[PDB]
Coordinates of C-alpha atoms and ligand atoms in Angstrom, one line a residue:
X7 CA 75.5 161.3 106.1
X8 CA 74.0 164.3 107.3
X9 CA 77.0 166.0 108.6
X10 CA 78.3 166.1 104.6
X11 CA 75.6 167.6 103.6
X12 CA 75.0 170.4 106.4
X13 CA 78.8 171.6 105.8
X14 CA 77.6 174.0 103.0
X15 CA 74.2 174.8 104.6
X16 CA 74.1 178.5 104.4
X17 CA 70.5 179.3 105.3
X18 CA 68.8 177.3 108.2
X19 CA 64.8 179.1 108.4
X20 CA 63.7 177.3 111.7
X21 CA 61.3 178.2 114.3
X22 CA 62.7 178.1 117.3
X23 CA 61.5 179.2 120.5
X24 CA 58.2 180.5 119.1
X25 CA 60.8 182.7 116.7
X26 CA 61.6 182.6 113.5
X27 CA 66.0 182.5 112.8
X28 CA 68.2 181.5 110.8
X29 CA 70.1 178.7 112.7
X30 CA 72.8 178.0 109.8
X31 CA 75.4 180.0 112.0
X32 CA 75.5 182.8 109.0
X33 CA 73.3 185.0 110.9
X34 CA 70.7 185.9 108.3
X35 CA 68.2 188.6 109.6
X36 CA 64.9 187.6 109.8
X37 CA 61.4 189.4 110.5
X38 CA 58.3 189.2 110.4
X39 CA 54.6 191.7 108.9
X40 CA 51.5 191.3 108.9
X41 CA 49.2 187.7 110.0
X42 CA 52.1 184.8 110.2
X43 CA 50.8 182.1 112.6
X44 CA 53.6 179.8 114.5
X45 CA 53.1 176.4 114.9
X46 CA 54.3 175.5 118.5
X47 CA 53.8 171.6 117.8
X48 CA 56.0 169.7 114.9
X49 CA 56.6 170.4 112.4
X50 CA 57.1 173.7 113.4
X51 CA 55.8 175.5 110.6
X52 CA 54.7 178.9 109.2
X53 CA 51.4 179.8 108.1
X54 CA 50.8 182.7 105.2
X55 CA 47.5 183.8 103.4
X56 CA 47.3 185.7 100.7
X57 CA 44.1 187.6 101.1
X58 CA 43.8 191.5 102.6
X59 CA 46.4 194.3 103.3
X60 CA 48.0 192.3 106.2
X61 CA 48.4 189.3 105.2
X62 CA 51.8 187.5 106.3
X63 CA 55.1 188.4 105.2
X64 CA 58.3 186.8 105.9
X65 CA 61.7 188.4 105.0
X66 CA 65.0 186.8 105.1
X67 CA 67.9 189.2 104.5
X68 CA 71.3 187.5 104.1
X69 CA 74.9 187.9 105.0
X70 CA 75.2 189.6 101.0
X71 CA 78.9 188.2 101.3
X72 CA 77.9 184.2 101.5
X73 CA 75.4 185.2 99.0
X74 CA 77.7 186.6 96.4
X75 CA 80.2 183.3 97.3
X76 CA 77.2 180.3 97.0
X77 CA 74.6 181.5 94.9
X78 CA 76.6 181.9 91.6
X79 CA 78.4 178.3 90.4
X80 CA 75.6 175.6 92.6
X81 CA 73.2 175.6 94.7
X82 CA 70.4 174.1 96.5
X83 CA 67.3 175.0 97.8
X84 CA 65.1 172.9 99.9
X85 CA 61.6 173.3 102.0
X86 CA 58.9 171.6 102.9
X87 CA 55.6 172.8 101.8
X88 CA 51.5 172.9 101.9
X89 CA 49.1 174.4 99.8
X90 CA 45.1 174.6 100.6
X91 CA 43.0 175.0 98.4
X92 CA 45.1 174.5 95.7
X93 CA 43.0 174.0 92.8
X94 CA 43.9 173.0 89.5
X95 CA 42.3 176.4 87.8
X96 CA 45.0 178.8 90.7
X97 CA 45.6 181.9 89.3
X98 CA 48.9 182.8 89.5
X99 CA 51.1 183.8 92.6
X100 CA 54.6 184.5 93.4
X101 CA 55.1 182.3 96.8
X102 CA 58.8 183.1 97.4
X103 CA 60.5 185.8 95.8
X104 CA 64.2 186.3 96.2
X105 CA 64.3 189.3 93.0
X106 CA 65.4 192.5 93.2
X107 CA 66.1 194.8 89.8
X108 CA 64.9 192.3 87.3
X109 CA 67.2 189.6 88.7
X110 CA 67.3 186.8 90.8
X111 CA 65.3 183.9 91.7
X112 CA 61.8 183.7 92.3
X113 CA 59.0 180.8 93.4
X114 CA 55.4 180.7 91.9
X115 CA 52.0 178.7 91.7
X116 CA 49.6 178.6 89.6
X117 CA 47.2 176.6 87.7
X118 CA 48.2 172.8 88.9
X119 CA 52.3 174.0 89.1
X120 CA 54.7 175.3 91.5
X121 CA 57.6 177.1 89.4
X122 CA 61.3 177.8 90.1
X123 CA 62.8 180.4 87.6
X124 CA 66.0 181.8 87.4
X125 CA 65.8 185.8 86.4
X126 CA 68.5 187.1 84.3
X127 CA 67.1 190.1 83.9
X128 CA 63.8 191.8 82.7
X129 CA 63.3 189.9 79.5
X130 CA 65.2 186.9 80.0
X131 CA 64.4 184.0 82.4
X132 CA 64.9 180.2 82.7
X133 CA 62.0 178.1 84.7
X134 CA 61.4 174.3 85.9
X135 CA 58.7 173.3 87.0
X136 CA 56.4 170.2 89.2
X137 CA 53.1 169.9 87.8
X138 CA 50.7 167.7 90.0
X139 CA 48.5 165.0 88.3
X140 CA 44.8 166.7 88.3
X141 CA 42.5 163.5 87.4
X142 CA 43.6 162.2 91.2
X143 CA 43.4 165.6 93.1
X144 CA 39.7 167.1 91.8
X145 CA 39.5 168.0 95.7
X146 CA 42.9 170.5 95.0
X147 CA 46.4 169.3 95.8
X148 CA 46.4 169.9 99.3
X149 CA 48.9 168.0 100.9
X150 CA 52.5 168.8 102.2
X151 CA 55.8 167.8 99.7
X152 CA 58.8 168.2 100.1
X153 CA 60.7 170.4 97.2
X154 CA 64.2 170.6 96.2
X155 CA 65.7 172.7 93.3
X156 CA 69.5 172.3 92.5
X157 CA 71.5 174.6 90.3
X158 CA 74.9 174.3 88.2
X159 CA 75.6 177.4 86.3
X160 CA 78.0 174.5 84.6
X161 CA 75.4 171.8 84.2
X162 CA 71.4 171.5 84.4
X163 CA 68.6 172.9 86.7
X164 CA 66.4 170.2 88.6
X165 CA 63.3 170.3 90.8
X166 CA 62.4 167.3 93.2
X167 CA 59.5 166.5 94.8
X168 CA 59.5 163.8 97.7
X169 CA 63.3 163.2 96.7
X170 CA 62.3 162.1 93.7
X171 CA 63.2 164.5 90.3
X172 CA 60.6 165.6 88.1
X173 CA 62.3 168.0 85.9
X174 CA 66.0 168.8 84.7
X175 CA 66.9 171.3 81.8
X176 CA 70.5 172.4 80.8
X177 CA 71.3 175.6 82.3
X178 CA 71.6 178.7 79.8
X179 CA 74.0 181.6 79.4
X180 CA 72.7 183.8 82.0
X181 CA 75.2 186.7 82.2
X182 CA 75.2 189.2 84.4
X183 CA 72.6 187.5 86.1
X184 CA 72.5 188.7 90.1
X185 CA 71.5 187.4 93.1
X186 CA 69.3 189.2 96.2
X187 CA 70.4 188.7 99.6
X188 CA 66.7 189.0 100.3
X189 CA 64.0 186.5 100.3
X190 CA 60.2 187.2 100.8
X191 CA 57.9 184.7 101.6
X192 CA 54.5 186.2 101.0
X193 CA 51.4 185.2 98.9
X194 CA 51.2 187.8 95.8
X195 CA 48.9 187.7 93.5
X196 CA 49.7 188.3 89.5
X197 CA 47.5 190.7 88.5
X198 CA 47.8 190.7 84.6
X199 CA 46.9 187.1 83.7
X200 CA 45.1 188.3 82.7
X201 CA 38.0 187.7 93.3
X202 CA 39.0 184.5 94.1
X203 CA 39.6 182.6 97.5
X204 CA 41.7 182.9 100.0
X205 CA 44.5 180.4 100.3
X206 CA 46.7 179.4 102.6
X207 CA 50.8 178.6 102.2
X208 CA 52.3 176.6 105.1
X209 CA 56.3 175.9 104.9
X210 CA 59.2 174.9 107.4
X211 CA 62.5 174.1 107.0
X212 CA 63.5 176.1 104.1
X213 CA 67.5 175.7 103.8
X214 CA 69.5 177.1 100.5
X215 CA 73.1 175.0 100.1
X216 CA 75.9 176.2 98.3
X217 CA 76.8 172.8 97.0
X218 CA 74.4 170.9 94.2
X219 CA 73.2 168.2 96.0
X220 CA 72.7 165.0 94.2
X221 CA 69.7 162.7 94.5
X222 CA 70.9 160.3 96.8
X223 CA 72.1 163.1 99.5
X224 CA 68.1 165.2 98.5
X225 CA 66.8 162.3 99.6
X226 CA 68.9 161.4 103.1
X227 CA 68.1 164.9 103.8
X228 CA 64.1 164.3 102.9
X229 CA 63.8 161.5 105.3
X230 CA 66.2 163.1 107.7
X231 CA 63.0 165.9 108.2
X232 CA 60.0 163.3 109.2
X233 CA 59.3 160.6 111.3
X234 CA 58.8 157.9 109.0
X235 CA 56.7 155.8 111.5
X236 CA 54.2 158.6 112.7
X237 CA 51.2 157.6 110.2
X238 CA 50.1 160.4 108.2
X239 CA 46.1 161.7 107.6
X240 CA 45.9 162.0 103.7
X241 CA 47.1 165.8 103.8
X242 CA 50.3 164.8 105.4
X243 CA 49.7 165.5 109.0
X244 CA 50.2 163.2 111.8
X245 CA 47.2 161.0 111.9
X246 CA 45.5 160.6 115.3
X247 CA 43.2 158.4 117.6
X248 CA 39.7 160.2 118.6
X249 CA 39.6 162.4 115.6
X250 CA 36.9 161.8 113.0
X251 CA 38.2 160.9 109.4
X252 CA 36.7 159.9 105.9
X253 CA 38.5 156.9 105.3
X254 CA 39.3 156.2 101.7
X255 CA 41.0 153.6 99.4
X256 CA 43.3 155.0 97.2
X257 CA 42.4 153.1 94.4
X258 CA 38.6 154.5 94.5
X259 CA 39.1 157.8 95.5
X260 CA 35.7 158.8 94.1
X261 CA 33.9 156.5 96.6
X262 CA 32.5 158.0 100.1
X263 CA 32.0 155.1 103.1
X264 CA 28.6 154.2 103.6
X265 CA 26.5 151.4 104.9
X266 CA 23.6 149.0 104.5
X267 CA 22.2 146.5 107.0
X268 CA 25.8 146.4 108.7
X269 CA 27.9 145.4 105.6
X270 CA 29.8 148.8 104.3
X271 CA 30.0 149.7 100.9
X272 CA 31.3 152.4 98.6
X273 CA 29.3 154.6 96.7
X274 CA 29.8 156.9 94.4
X275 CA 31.0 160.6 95.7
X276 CA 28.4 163.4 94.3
X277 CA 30.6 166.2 95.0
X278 CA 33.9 165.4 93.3
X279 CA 35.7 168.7 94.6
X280 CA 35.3 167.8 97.9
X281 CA 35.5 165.0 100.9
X282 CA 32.5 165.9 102.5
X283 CA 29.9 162.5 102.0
X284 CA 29.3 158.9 103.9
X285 CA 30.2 158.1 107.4
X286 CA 33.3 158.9 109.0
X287 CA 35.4 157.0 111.2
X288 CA 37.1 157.1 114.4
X289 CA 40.7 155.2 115.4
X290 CA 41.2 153.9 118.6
X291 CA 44.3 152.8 120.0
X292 CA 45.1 149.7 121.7
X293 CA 48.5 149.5 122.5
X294 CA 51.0 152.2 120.7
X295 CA 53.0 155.0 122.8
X296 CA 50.8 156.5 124.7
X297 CA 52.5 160.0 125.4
X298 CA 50.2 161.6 122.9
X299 CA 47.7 160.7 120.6
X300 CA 49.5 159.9 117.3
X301 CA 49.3 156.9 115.3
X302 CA 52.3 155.3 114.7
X303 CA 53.5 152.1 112.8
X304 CA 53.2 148.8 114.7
X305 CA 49.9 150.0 116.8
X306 CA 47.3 147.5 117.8
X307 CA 44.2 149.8 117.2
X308 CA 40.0 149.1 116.1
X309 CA 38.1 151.7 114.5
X310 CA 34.4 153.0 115.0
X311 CA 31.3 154.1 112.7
X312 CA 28.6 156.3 114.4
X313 CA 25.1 156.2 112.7
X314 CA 22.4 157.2 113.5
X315 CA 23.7 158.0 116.8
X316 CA 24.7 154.5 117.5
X317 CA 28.4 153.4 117.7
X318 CA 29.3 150.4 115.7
X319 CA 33.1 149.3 115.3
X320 CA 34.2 148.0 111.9
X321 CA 34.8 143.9 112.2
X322 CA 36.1 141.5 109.9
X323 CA 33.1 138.8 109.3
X324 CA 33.1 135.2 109.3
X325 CA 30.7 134.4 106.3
X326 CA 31.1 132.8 103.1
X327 CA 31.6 135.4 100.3
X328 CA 30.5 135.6 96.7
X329 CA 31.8 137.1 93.6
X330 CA 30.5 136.6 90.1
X331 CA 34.0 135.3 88.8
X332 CA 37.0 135.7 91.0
X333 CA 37.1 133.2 94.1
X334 CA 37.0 134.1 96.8
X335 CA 39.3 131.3 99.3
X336 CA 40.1 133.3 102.3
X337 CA 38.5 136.9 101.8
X338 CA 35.9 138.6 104.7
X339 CA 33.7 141.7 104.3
X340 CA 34.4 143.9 106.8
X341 CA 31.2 145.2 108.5
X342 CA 30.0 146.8 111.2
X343 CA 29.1 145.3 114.8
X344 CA 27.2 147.1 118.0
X345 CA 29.9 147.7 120.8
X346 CA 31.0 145.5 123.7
X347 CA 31.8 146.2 127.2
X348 CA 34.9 144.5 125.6
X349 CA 37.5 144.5 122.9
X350 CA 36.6 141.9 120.7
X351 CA 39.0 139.7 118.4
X352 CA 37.4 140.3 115.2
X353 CA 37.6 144.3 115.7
X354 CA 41.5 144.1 116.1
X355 CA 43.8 145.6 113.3
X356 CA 47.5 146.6 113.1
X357 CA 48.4 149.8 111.2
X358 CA 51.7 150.2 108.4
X359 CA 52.4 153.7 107.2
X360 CA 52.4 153.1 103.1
X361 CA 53.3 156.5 101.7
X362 CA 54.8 157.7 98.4
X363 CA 55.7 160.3 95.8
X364 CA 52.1 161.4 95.4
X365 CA 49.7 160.1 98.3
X366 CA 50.4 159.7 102.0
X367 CA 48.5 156.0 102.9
X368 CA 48.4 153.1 105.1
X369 CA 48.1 149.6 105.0
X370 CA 46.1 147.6 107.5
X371 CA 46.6 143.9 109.0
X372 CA 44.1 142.0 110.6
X373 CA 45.6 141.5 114.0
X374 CA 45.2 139.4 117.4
X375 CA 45.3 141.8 120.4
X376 CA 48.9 141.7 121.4
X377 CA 50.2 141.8 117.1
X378 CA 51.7 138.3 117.5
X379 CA 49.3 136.6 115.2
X380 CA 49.0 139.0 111.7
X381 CA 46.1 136.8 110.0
X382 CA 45.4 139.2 106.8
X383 CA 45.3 142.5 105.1
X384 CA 42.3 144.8 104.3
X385 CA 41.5 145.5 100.6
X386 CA 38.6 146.1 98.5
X387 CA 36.1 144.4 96.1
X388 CA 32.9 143.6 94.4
X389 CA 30.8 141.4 95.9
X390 CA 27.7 139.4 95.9
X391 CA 25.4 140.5 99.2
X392 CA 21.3 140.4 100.0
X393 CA 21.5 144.3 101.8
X394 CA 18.7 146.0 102.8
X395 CA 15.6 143.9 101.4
X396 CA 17.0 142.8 98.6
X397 CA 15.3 139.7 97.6
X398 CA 18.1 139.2 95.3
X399 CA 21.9 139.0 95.6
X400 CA 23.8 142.3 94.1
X401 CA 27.1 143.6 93.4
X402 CA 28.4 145.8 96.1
X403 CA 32.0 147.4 96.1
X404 CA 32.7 146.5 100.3
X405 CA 35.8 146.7 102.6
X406 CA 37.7 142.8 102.9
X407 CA 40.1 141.6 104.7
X408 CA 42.3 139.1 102.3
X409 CA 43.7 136.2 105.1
X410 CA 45.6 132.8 103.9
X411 CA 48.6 133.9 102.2
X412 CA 48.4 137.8 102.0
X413 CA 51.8 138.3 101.2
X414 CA 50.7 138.4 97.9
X415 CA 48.8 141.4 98.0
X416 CA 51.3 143.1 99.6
X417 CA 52.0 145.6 96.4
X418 CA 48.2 146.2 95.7
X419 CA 47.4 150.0 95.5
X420 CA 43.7 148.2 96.5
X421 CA 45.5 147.8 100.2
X422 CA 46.6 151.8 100.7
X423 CA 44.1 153.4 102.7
X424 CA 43.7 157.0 103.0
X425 CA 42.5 159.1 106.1
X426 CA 41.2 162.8 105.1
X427 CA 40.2 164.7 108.4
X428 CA 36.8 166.1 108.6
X429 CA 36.6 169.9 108.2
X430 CA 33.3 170.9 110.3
Ligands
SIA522 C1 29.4 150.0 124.7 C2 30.8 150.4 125.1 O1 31.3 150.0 126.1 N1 31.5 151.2 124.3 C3 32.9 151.6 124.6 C4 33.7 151.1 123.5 C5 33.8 149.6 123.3 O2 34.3 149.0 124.5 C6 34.7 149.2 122.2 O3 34.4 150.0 121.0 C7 34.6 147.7 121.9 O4 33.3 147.5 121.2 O5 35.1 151.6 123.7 C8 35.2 153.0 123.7 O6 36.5 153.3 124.0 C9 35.0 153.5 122.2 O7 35.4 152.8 121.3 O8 34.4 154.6 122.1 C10 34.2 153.7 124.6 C11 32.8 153.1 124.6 O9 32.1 153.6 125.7
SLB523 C1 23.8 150.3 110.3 C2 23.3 150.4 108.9 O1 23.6 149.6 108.0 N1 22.5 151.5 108.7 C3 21.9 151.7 107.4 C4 20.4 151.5 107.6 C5 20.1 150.0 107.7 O2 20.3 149.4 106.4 C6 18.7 149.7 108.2 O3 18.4 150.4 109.5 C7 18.4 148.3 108.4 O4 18.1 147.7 107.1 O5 19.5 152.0 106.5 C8 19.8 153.4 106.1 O6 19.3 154.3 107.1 C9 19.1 153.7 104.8 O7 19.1 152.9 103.9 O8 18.5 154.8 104.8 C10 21.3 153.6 105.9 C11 22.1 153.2 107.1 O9 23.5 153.3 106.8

């Protein structure tokens, strides 16, 4: 129902031809200062930074006349957005700033929130706000959403995140209130808070509505902007085959990959802040669209471990397992196995996007080679192994792959895997 929704689209920010314009058909003016870099693949986006004299600026001057007739009974605004590094101790920075005279609107970070305020003038204000949760993000929350803020002068002011709302409060009296035609997307620093690092601010598709769009329409409109069955790397970009990642499971977050006499296991991250410990892996496509390089639900794909300078590929093992009281009918460690000339059986998985509000994630399926036979799913646990000398059997927290009736694991957070791409 996308053609309901787009009739009171006022302000379409798209790039387009390597340009930024407004495509809404209102015409608003559009340029550009300073360092903003274009993205010529999807999803199109903008990149700002916030540090030196010219750093990017964006400004979007509108029509004042569909301004003065949208902005002041409902309205919507709607973008999609990334943050890196944003750490939970950000100072504070305006991020979108449509004010002018000590009125308007305006769009800020800081700390672990991003912050929509309405500005009646220069000692009044009304503000909503998204906070992210900080005990699962210690490495900053760096990932794109997807926010919408409505407005009824009449009724309450929300903020959504990933269609979902996070924050309504009834709208005050906010006479005399005024709106700019002008919006400035540009990373500003507050000064009185009262030299830190640089960060980075990526949006696209930032559209303003002159209706209040309710949740069910925020969220058509959401999923109208991705393609659901590209697989996404942990910071919500499109994950890819032959690109080194630190695969994670979501519900041990604060466990790196590593490896002992060919059985993996998790240990415990040392640097908290960051993704940078344990082996990485490489995914490797067997059958999925081969016009490019993304991974994309349904894929017949294996994955590979270098150590040491040999390649392994991850394999689901035929041995007995122990575990000190669970059973354990039907569950494989997943290890590591030297490479063949061919694709072997045991190597062979079949990838599910798995995303939601807060992480983007996968599940993975133990799979014959052409995906007709699904035998299992991959999950985690603590088991009983003999690794590296050990004279004695010892608990080790190791990749599985659950087979006999996996349906039933099917809503385990222990299932979502996590793909965070390797800076250096
Ligand atoms: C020894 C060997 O032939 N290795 C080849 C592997 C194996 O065929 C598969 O990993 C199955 O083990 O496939 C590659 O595409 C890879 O994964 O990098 C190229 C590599 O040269
Ligand atoms: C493939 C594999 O498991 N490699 C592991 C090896 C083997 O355990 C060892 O060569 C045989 O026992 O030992 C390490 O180098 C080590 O403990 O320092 C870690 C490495 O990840």
């Amino acid at each position: 129902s996308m053609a309901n929704i787009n009739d009171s689209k006022i302000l379409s920010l798209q790039n387009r031809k390597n340009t930024l314009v407004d495509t809404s058909g209102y015409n608003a003016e559009v340029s550009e200062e300073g360092d903003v870099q274009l993205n010529p693949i999807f999803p199109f986006d903008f990149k700002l930074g916030s540090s030196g004299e010219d750093r990017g600026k964006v400004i979007v001057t509108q029509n004042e006349n569909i301004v003065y007739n949208s902005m002041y009974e409902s309205f919507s605004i709607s973008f999609w957005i990334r943050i890196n590094k944003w750490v939970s101790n950000l100072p504070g920075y305006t991020i979108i700033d449509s004010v002018k005279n000590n009125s308007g609107w305006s769009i800020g970070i800081i700390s672990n929130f991003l912050v929509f305020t309405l500005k009646q003038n220069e000692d009044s204000e009304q503000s909503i706000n998204f906070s992210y949760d900080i005990s699962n993000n210690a490495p900053g929350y760096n990932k794109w959403f997807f926010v919408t803020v409505t407005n009824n002068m009449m009724g309450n002011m929300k903020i959504y995140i990933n269609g979902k709302l996070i924050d309504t409060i009834k709208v005050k009296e906010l006479t005399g209130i005024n709106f700019s035609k002008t919006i400035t997307f540009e990373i500003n620093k507050i000064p009185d808070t009262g030299d830190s690092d640089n960060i980075n601010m990526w949006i696209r598709d930032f559209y303003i509505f002159a209706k209040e769009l309710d949740g069910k329409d925020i969220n058509i409109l959401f999923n109208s902007l991705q393609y659901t069955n590209v697989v996404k790397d942990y910071w919500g970009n499109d994950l890819r085959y032959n690109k080194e990642y630190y695969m994670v499971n979501i519900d041990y977050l604060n466990r790196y990959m590593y490896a002992n006499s060919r059985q993996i296991v998790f240990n415990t991250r040392r640097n908290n802040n960051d993704f940078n410990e344990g082996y990485k892996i490489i995914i490797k496509r067997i059958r999925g669209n081969t016009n490019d390089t993304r991974v994309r639900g349904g894929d017949i794909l294996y994955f590979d471990m270098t150590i040491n300078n040999k390649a392994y590929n991850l394999f689901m093992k035929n041995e007995t397992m122990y575990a000190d009281n669970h059973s354990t009918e039907d569950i494989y460690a997943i290890g590591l196995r030297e490479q063949t000339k061919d694709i072997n059986d045991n190597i062979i998985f079949q990838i599910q996007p798995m995303n939601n509000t807060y992480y983007y994630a996968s599940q993975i399926f133990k799979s014959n080679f052409n995906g007709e036979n699904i035998s299992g799913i991959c999950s985690i646990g603590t088991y009983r192994f003999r690794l590296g000398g050990d004279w004695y059997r010892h608990n080790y927290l190791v990749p599985t792959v659950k087979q006999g009736n996996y349906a039933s694991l099917l809503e385990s957070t222990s299932t979502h895997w996590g793909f965070v791409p390797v800076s250096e």
